[PDB]
Amino acid sequence: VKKLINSQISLLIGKGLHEFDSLRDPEVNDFRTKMRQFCEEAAAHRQQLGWVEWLQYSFPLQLEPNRALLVNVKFEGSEESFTFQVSTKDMPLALMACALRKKATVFRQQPEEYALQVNGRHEYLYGNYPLCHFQYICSCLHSGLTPHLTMVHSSSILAMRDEQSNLWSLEQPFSIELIEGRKVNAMKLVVQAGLFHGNEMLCKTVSSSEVNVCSEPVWKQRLEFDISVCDLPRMARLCFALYAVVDCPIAWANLMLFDYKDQLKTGERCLYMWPSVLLNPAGTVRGNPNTESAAALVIYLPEVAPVYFPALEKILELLREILERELYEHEKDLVWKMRHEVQEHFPEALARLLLVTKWNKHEDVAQMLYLLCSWPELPVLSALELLDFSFPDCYVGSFAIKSLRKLTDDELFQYLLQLVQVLKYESYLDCELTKFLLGRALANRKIGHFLFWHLRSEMHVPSVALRFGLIMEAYCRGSTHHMKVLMKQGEALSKLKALNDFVKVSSQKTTKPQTKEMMHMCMRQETYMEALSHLQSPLDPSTLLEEVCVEQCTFMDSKMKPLWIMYSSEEAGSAGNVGIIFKNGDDLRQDMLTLQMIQLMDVLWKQEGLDLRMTPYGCLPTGDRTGLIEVVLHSDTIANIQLNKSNMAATAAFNKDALLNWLKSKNPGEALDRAIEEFTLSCAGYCVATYVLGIGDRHSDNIMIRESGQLFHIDFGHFLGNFRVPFILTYDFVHVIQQGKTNNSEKFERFRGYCERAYTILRRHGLLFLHLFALMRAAGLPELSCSKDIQYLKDSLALGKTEEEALKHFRVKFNEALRESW
Numbered sequence: 058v059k060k061l062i063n064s065q066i067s068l069l070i071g072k073g074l075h076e077f078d079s080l081r082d083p084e085v086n087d088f089r090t091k092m093r094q095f096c097e098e099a100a101a102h103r104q105q106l107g108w109v110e111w112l113q114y115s116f117p118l119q120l121e122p123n124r125a126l127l128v129n130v131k132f133e134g135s136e137e138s139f140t141f142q143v144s145t146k147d148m149p150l151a152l153m154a155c156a157l158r159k160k161a162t163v164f165r166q167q168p169e170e171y172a173l174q175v176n177g178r179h180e181y182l183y184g185n186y187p188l189c190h191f192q193y194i195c196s197c198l199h200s201g202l203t204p205h206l207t208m209v210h211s212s213s214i215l216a217m218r219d220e221q222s223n224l225w226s227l228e229q230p231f232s233i234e235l236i237e238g239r240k241v242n243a244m245k246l247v248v249q250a251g252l253f254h255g256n257e258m259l260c261k262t263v264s265s266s267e268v269n270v271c272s273e274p275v276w277k278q279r280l281e282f283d284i285s286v287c288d289l290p291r292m293a294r295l296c297f298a299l300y301a302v303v304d305c306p307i308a309w310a311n312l313m314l315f316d317y318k319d320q321l322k323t324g325e326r327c328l329y330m331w332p333s334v335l336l337n338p339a340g341t342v343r344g345n346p347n348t349e350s351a352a353a354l355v356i357y358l359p360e361v362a363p364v365y366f367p368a369l370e371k372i373l374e375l376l377r378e379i380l381e382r383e384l385y386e387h388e389k390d391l392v393w394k395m396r397h398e399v400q401e402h403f404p405e406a407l408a409r410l411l412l413v414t415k416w417n418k419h420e421d422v423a424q425m426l427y428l429l430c431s432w433p434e435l436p437v438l439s440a441l442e443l444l445d446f447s448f449p450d451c452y453v454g455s456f457a458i459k460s461l462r463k464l465t466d467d468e469l470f471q472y473l474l475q476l477v478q479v480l481k482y483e484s485y486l487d488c489e490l491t492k493f494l495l496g497r498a499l500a501n502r503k504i505g506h507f508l509f510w511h512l513r514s515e516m517h518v519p520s521v522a523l524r525f526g527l528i529m530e531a532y533c534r535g536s537t538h539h540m541k542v543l544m545k546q547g548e549a550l551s552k553l554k555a556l557n558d559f560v561k562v563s564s565q566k567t568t569k570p571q572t573k574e575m576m577h578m579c580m581r582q583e584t585y586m587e588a589l590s591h592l593q594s595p596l597d598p599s600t601l602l603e604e605v606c607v608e609q610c611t612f613m614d615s616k617m618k619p620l621w622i623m624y625s626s627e628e629a630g631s632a633g634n635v636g637i638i639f640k641n642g643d644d645l646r647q648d649m650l651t652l653q654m655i656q657l658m659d660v661l662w663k664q665e666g667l668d669l670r671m672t673p674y675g676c677l678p679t680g681d682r683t684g685l686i687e688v689v690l691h692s693d694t695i696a697n698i699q700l701n702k703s704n705m706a707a708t709a710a711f712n713k714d715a716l717l718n719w720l721k722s723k724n725p726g727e728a729l730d731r732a733i734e735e736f737t738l739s740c741a742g743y744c745v746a747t748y749v750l751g752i753g754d755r756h757s758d759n760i761m762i763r764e765s766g767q768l769f770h771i772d773f774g775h776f777l778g779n780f781r782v783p784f785i786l787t788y789d790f791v792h793v794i795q796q797g798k799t800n801n802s803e804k805f806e807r808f809r810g811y812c813e814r815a816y817t818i819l820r821r822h823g824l825l826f827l828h829l830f831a832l833m834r835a836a837g838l839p840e841l842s843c844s845k846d847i848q849y850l851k852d853s854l855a856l857g858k859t860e861e862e863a864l865k866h867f868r869v870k871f872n873e874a875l876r877e878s879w
């Protein structure tokens with residue numbers, strides 16, 4: 058059986074476990090056994106949670122960031138059901154109490170023994186929260202639908218938990234022998250080598266001698282560094298670049314100077330190099346796995362004798378405010394001079410102080426560290442900054458995580474993407490971020506779900522295959538049942554891939570009707586109906602994808618022929634009708650990032666009492682240029698609506714009215730007012746978001762409308778101006794906002810106010826967007842590479858200005874946009 062699990066994990070993670078063994082690597086070995094132990098204890102803890110606590114793990118609450126409503130309630134093993142009138146202000150307990158009085162009178166005769174399940178979803182209502190604080194109840198109130206809930210007893214929840222069981226001494230210069238290589242090229246070869254601590258060089262770079270493109274080249278030369286061996290910090294990174302000149306980059310490679318056991322490295326190393334875009338301090342510190350073809354480098358670390366980085370005990374033993382809100386040398390000097398006063402009176406300036414400490418002088422690093430050890434904990438915002446590559450020191454990183462432990466699960470969820478990308482900065486396999494991520498993942502199944510997919514979706518990338526593989530295995534050890542739930546998900550994704558391939562071939566040889574009919578036959582095969590039905594959605598583990606609705610599945614006409622799959626569910630009713638899009642061949646990472654940022658804006662806006670009626674729909678890369686998009690039902694693109702089709706409700710005399718006619722047919726009489734309002738609020742949100750994010754190429758094919766009137770955006774291929782994208786006012790939206798009128802400054806100016814409020818709120822969290830984008834730089838996304846992309850966000854949010862200047866400036870961009878509206 059232990060054999061069976063092993064094989065199922067290998068299949069799930071997209072890598073055979075035997076492949077970890079073949080490496081015969083102490084570090085991999087150690088990571089695997091340590092992390093397995095840590096995960097198994099978390100799984101032990103879990104099997105003994107109270108039932109409310111188990112619910113908290115398995116289905117965490119979906120909460121928002123007087124009035125009467127109707128709700129329908131039923132008991133688990135029963136057809137019969139009761140509709141109740143309650144207040145939005147009532148706790149779930151009150152509602153559970155009615156349900157039992159209604160049961161007892163029909164049936165002829167304790168609320169605390171139950172929780173409420175959302176019908177046909179893995180979602181639950183419990184806690185001390187007014188009904189309208191639950192996202193589900195909120196949703197229902199807006200759309201107008203009646204909440205439908207099931208009373209699930211405590212014994213039923215426990216049956217679920219039950220079924221889911223499992224040194225200072227060395228003053229001489231640092232130096233290496235560069236021995237030889239075995240590359241490929243056209244001219245002379247050179248090797249540049251520098252020592253780095255993050256971005257900062259620890260001393261000048263040093264160069265090789267020139268030897269012709271010859272072989273299989275040989276050097277046997279000492280390269281000596283203009284720093285002493287006792288001054289190398291714990292996180293010292295030696296970087297190499299090999300190129301050609303009479304400039305032509307060939308390859309690079311980096312390693313840590315201390316291994317994972319803190320021991321300084323000696324003697325000979327073989328370095329399998331990565332092929333180039335000259336020095337790459339931020340690149341991984343593990344060699345290329347394609348050792349068959351990779352250019353190799355042999356160097357020799359000299360035996361300085363066995364030496365270890367001194368323990369913490371030995372470490373411990375050893376106009377200010379005016380600037381303190383890029384600094385000159387003397388400025389740096391004051392800060393260092395006044396570090397105690399910084400620790401005492403300005404703890405939040407830790408980072409600026411860290412950036413001024415001389416990391417190439419051990420006495421100084423000792424002193425900076427001395428302060429770090431008694432530094433008070435910092436807010437989440439500050440901690441996120443410290444995770445940046447600018448702070449490679451492990452005591453800093455450890456302090457950062459320590460300051461992050463106070464993340465709520467909702468917050469952790471919101472930043473999960475960036476924390477994962479930061480893993481690519483790590484120097485070793487066993488690290489605080491990993492154990493942190495895994496422990497929080499083992500305490501929250503939703504966290505666990507998205508961690509798994511963020512990791513799984515990158516297994517085709519050699520620089521991270523090993524690390525990410527190792528983490529997913531360890532997690533699997535911590536949850537056998539969820540492993541099985543995830544495979545079921547991977548099996549469906551495997552079949553969609555095969556079906557998508559057929560559709561690609563087929564569509565090149567036959568008409569769309571014929572391909573769709575054969576797609577349906579293919580889907581109707583037993584293997585497919587089985588693989589495609591009865592899973593949790595990778596887009597949202599609380600969404601259940603029950604019976605695939607074959608007749609309604611089809612595909613889109615764009616290059617990659619993405620599949621459009623519909624599902625239904627008797628037990629969920631209408632909310633069990635959900636749709637996913639499967640795309641293979643395009644990159645979805647940029648869309649996911651953009652959509653997480655828009656969703657963050659929505660959270661910040663709602664935290665200040667501003668709901669702009671956003672449509673934050675799921676988007677999730679799952680594999681190599683593979684992932685899923687959630688279908689927002691009851692929506693259509695502007696373009697489709699603007700086709701101005703005859704024999705249709707929305708039949709216009711002027712194309713400018715098409716959109717308004719459409720909203721009118723979806724929203725008869727009095728409902729129209731609210732639809733126009735919903736359109737107005739969301740339009741503001743999206744105009745601000747796309748402006749702040751530099752999302753261009755917006756047009757009537759990538760903008761959508763919901764039947765409620767909410768406007769949203771799909772298919773982002775560009776952001777951060779990676780085409781300065783101007784603010785955008787489209788006429789036809791302005792026409793809707795104006796309720797059809799040529800002049801309606803009263804409506805138009807409400808709309809301006811919404812844009813300004815939304816904009817000024819985001820400026821106030823400008824710093825949170827900058828730290829998050831900074832961490833995203835580790836993604837390797839082509840439009841998020843360097844400083845100018847970040848600067849795009851400084852400029853868009855005008856963060857160097859007072860609120861009055863930024864607003865005035867914004868007013869010019871906006872007024873400029875209105876002129877541009879015809």
Ligand SMILES: CS(=O)(=O)N1CCN(Cc2cc3nc(-c4cccc5[nH]ncc45)nc(N4CCOCC4)c3s2)CC1
Nearest residue numbers: 612613614615648674686687688689692694771772773
């Ligand atoms: C004739 S046809 O069969 O070829 N086709 C043409 C017109 N289509 C309209 C659509 C295109 C469309 N593209 C996307 C997408 C495409 C590429 C990247 C993306 N990122 N995010 C979305 C998205 N996402 C969509 N969503 C996302 C969620 O909300 C409703 C449907 C829709 S709806 C429907 C039928």
